[PDB]
Design an enzyme around this catalytic site. Structure first.
Site, PDB file in Angstrom:
ATOM      1  N   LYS A 123       0.599  -1.295   0.119  1.00  0.00           N
ATOM      2  CA  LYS A 123      -0.188  -0.029  -0.083  1.00  0.00           C
ATOM      3  C   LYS A 123       0.599   1.200   0.211  1.00  0.00           C
ATOM      4  CE  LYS A 123      -3.231  -1.004  -1.139  1.00  0.00           C
ATOM      5  NZ  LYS A 123      -3.278  -1.568  -1.529  1.00  0.00           N
ATOM      6  N   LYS A 146       7.223  -7.580  -9.442  1.00  0.00           N
ATOM      7  CA  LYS A 146       6.514  -6.938  -8.320  1.00  0.00           C
ATOM      8  C   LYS A 146       6.565  -7.161  -7.739  1.00  0.00           C
ATOM      9  CE  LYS A 146       2.405  -5.716  -6.114  1.00  0.00           C
ATOM     10  NZ  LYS A 146       0.818  -5.965  -6.078  1.00  0.00           N
ATOM     11  N   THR A 147       7.620  -7.197  -5.917  1.00  0.00           N
ATOM     12  CA  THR A 147       7.415  -7.508  -4.719  1.00  0.00           C
ATOM     13  C   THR A 147       7.169  -7.213  -3.957  1.00  0.00           C
ATOM     14  OG1 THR A 147       8.717  -9.491  -3.466  1.00  0.00           O
ATOM     15  CG2 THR A 147       9.784  -7.558  -4.924  1.00  0.00           C
ATOM     16  N   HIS A 148       6.677  -7.337  -2.373  1.00  0.00           N
ATOM     17  CA  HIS A 148       6.695  -6.305  -1.206  1.00  0.00           C
ATOM     18  C   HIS A 148       7.831  -7.321  -0.045  1.00  0.00           C
ATOM     19  CE1 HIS A 148       3.076  -4.555  -2.862  1.00  0.00           C
ATOM     20  NE2 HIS A 148       2.596  -5.344  -2.688  1.00  0.00           N
ATOM     21  N   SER A 179      -4.499   2.769   4.084  1.00  0.00           N
ATOM     22  CA  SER A 179      -4.778   2.717   2.930  1.00  0.00           C
ATOM     23  C   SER A 179      -4.165   0.371   3.796  1.00  0.00           C
ATOM     24  CB  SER A 179      -3.062   2.109   2.527  1.00  0.00           C
ATOM     25  OG  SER A 179      -3.636   1.950   1.260  1.00  0.00           O
ATOM     26  N   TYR A 217       6.739   7.931  -1.617  1.00  0.00           N
ATOM     27  CA  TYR A 217       5.681   8.837  -2.060  1.00  0.00           C
ATOM     28  C   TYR A 217       4.974   9.182  -2.078  1.00  0.00           C
ATOM     29  CZ  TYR A 217      -0.009   7.878  -2.860  1.00  0.00           C
ATOM     30  OH  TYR A 217      -0.676   8.679  -3.064  1.00  0.00           O
ATOM     31  N   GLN A 258      -6.492  10.711 -11.339  1.00  0.00           N
ATOM     32  CA  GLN A 258      -7.607  10.429 -11.871  1.00  0.00           C
ATOM     33  C   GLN A 258      -7.390   9.607 -12.769  1.00  0.00           C
ATOM     34  OE1 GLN A 258     -11.296  10.646 -10.762  1.00  0.00           O
ATOM     35  NE2 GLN A 258     -10.459  11.603  -9.914  1.00  0.00           N
ATOM     36  N   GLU A 259      -6.515   9.340 -14.028  1.00  0.00           N
ATOM     37  CA  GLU A 259      -6.644   8.607 -15.081  1.00  0.00           C
ATOM     38  C   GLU A 259      -6.577   7.210 -14.543  1.00  0.00           C
ATOM     39  OE1 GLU A 259      -5.269   9.036 -18.394  1.00  0.00           O
ATOM     40  OE2 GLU A 259      -4.912  10.915 -18.307  1.00  0.00           O
ATOM     41  N   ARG A 269      -7.890   4.692  -4.196  1.00  0.00           N
ATOM     42  CA  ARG A 269      -9.164   4.917  -3.062  1.00  0.00           C
ATOM     43  C   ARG A 269      -9.351   6.363  -2.410  1.00  0.00           C
ATOM     44  NH1 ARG A 269      -9.005   6.088   2.685  1.00  0.00           N
ATOM     45  NH2 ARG A 269      -6.647   6.198   2.420  1.00  0.00           N
ATOM     46  N   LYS A 270      -7.978   7.018  -1.832  1.00  0.00           N
ATOM     47  CA  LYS A 270      -7.898   8.488  -2.175  1.00  0.00           C
ATOM     48  C   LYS A 270      -6.620   9.635  -2.442  1.00  0.00           C
ATOM     49  CE  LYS A 270     -10.509   9.880   2.328  1.00  0.00           C
ATOM     50  NZ  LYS A 270     -10.547  10.414   3.445  1.00  0.00           N
ATOM     51  N   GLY A 271      -5.746   8.639  -2.888  1.00  0.00           N
ATOM     52  CA  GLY A 271      -4.401   9.010  -3.343  1.00  0.00           C
ATOM     53  C   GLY A 271      -4.032  10.202  -3.367  1.00  0.00           C
TER      54      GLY A 271
HETATM   55  N1  LIG Z   1      -1.902   7.323  -9.623  1.00  0.00           N
HETATM   56  C1  LIG Z   1      -1.933   7.487  -8.208  1.00  0.00           C
HETATM   57  N2  LIG Z   1      -1.649   8.335  -7.538  1.00  0.00           N
HETATM   58  C2  LIG Z   1      -1.807   9.055  -6.470  1.00  0.00           C
HETATM   59  N3  LIG Z   1      -1.321   7.304  -5.411  1.00  0.00           N
HETATM   60  C3  LIG Z   1      -1.938   6.218  -6.072  1.00  0.00           C
HETATM   61  C4  LIG Z   1      -2.386   6.130  -7.496  1.00  0.00           C
HETATM   62  N4  LIG Z   1      -2.211   4.569  -7.611  1.00  0.00           N
HETATM   63  C5  LIG Z   1      -2.164   3.627  -6.191  1.00  0.00           C
HETATM   64  N5  LIG Z   1      -2.041   5.424  -5.854  1.00  0.00           N
HETATM   65  C6  LIG Z   1      -2.584   4.922  -4.174  1.00  0.00           C
HETATM   66  O1  LIG Z   1      -1.489   3.756  -3.290  1.00  0.00           O
HETATM   67  C7  LIG Z   1      -1.798   3.076  -2.614  1.00  0.00           C
HETATM   68  C8  LIG Z   1      -1.895   1.208  -3.152  1.00  0.00           C
HETATM   69  O2  LIG Z   1      -0.656   1.502  -2.887  1.00  0.00           O
HETATM   70  P1  LIG Z   1      -0.357   0.015  -4.203  1.00  0.00           P
HETATM   71  O3  LIG Z   1      -0.382  -0.129  -5.175  1.00  0.00           O
HETATM   72  O4  LIG Z   1       1.196  -0.455  -3.169  1.00  0.00           O
HETATM   73  O5  LIG Z   1      -1.054  -1.123  -3.414  1.00  0.00           O
HETATM   74  C9  LIG Z   1      -3.831   3.563  -2.214  1.00  0.00           C
HETATM   75  O6  LIG Z   1      -3.487   4.359  -1.337  1.00  0.00           O
HETATM   76  P2  LIG Z   1      -4.865   5.223  -0.879  1.00  0.00           P
HETATM   77  O7  LIG Z   1      -5.975   3.567   0.135  1.00  0.00           O
HETATM   78  O8  LIG Z   1      -4.237   6.059   0.459  1.00  0.00           O
HETATM   79  O9  LIG Z   1      -5.657   5.624  -1.431  1.00  0.00           O
HETATM   80  C10 LIG Z   1      -3.317   4.182  -3.777  1.00  0.00           C
HETATM   81  O10 LIG Z   1      -4.971   5.080  -3.863  1.00  0.00           O
HETATM   82  O1  LIG Z   2      -0.348  -5.599  -3.361  1.00  0.00           O
HETATM   83  C1  LIG Z   2      -1.285  -7.055  -3.086  1.00  0.00           C
HETATM   84  C2  LIG Z   2      -1.504  -7.427  -1.786  1.00  0.00           C
HETATM   85 BR1  LIG Z   2      -0.221  -7.283  -0.245  1.00  0.00          BR
HETATM   86  C3  LIG Z   2      -2.285  -8.680  -1.165  1.00  0.00           C
HETATM   87  C4  LIG Z   2      -3.351  -9.018  -2.653  1.00  0.00           C
HETATM   88  C5  LIG Z   2      -3.613  -8.755  -3.706  1.00  0.00           C
HETATM   89  O2  LIG Z   2      -4.114  -9.156  -4.615  1.00  0.00           O
HETATM   90  C6  LIG Z   2      -5.044 -10.003  -4.118  1.00  0.00           C
HETATM   91  C7  LIG Z   2      -6.109 -10.139  -3.865  1.00  0.00           C
HETATM   92  C8  LIG Z   2      -7.235 -10.658  -3.481  1.00  0.00           C
HETATM   93  C9  LIG Z   2      -6.416 -12.562  -3.625  1.00  0.00           C
HETATM   94 BR2  LIG Z   2      -8.023 -14.165  -3.313  1.00  0.00          BR
HETATM   95  C10 LIG Z   2      -5.322 -13.207  -3.786  1.00  0.00           C
HETATM   96  C11 LIG Z   2      -4.320 -11.361  -4.815  1.00  0.00           C
HETATM   97 BR3  LIG Z   2      -2.361 -11.809  -5.124  1.00  0.00          BR
HETATM   98  C12 LIG Z   2      -1.933  -7.609  -3.996  1.00  0.00           C
HETATM   99 BR4  LIG Z   2      -2.244  -6.679  -5.462  1.00  0.00          BR
END
Ligand SMILES: Nc1ncnc2c1ncn2[C@@H]1O[C@H](COP(=O)(O)O)[C@@H](OP(=O)(O)O)[C@H]1O
Ligand SMILES: Oc1c(Br)ccc(Oc2ccc(Br)cc2Br)c1Br
Ligand code: NA
Length: 291
Positions: free
Chosen positions: A45, A103-105, A135, A190, A227-228, A254-256
């Site tokens: 997030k 992509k990885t966390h 988030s 961010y 927004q896009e 969500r809100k960004g």
């Molecule tokens: N183009 C953008 N500009 C600003 N925030 C963005 C964005 N794309 C995704 N996000 C925000 O990044 C978070 C999602 O993170 P991730 O991509 O790592 O899962 C969300 O935050 P919020 O829940 O605070 O809005 C999402 O809104």
């Molecule tokens: O960044 C993510 C994280 Br942390 C955890 C899950 C996920 O996507 C999913 C959403 C629902 C299921 Br069922 C499996 C996956 Br992967 C994402 Br993108």
């Protein structure tokens, strides 16, 4: 509740993780990188989707059509992700034509050894812990495979103790911050992308050894604006069924903004969080902005 967490999550290498991912962790462990792989690593997030689409656009030289050929989670596979036979990061990457974007966390210690051995470039993105917490909380609510996070203060207590998937945010950012001293690792915030997107976009172009131009830079900026991306079915996860991501409860985009923590943390929770934070982060040169 504590029972609920036990059914949903398991530790791997000392890190709390989605149970479905852990069952096939050997596939992640033994993953074979390629020298030209590009890793995008974040704590959950923190804006993964945002930087991913920016990177994809730089790869495709700003060709928006090429970025909609498939949804983002297919264009940029989630390395350690696994849903038995429904979704498979390692499989998707194996069958991919290079250059791959991954992509990885994962914290640096858990990243598959092959990435380090082949010296792959890594982009790390981080976000202030309070906004991450907000988030992540809504994410727990929207997405299947999470326990009930309870109230927000209860969730934040789990967050502070690193009892959420991918473990401690504190250890995550601090470990990656050390790696960021490497020339192969670009460390982004961010809040910096919010403040001056053009500056970070140009930074990304140079890191990936491409040519910066106003037209390309301009295309990335509006294409990757909140927004896009919120309206883009390629990037907003709305192609996923509600039984997997229920965006009627809370949208992925969500809100960004930076600072939504102000709308959720009470005065008391903020005092407690800040005190704990100072103790976790005191000995680090890494400094964030909450606004
Ligand atoms: N183009 C953008 N500009 C600003 N925030 C963005 C964005 N794309 C995704 N996000 C925000 O990044 C978070 C999602 O993170 P991730 O991509 O790592 O899962 C969300 O935050 P919020 O829940 O605070 O809005 C999402 O809104
Ligand atoms: O960044 C993510 C994280 Br942390 C955890 C899950 C996920 O996507 C999913 C959403 C629902 C299921 Br069922 C499996 C996956 Br992967 C994402 Br993108
Ligand atoms: Na660096």
């Amino acid at each position: 509740s504590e029972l609920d967490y036990y059914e949903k999550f398991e530790e791997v290498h000392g890190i709390l993780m989605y149970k479905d991912f852990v069952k096939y962790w050997d596939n992640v462990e033994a993953f074979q990188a390629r020298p030209d792989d590009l890793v995008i690593a974040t704590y959950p997030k923190s804006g993964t989707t945002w930087v991913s689409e920016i990177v994809y656009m730089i790869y495709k030289e700003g060709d928006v059509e090429k970025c909609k050929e498939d949804v983002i989670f297919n264009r940029i596979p989630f390395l350690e992700c696994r849903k038995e036979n429904l979704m498979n990061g390692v499989k998707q990457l194996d069958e991919m034509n290079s250059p791959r974007i991954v992509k990885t966390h994962l914290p640096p210690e858990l990243l598959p050894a092959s990435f380090w051995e082949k010296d792959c470039k890594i982009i790390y993105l981080c976000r202030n812990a309070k906004d991450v917490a907000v988030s992540f909380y809504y994410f727990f609510l929207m997405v299947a495979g999470h326990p009930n996070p309870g109230s927000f203060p209860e969730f934040v207590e789990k967050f502070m103790q690193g009892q959420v998937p991918y473990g401690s945010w504190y250890k995550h950012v601090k470990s990656w911050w050390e790696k960021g001293k490497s020339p192969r690792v670009l460390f982004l915030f961010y809040e910096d992308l919010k403040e001056d997107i053009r500056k970070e976009v140009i930074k990304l172009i140079h890191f990936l050894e491409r040519k910066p131009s106003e037209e390309l830079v301009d295309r990335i900026i509006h294409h990757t604006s909140f927004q896009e991306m919120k309206n883009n079915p390629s990037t907003n996860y709305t192609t996923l069924p509600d039984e997997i991501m229920n965006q009627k409860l809370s949208p992925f985009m969500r809100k960004g903004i930076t600072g939504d923590w102000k709308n959720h943390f009470t005065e008391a929770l903020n005092e407690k969080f800040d005190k704990h934070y100072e103790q976790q982060m005191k000995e680090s040169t890494l400094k964030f902005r909450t606004e």
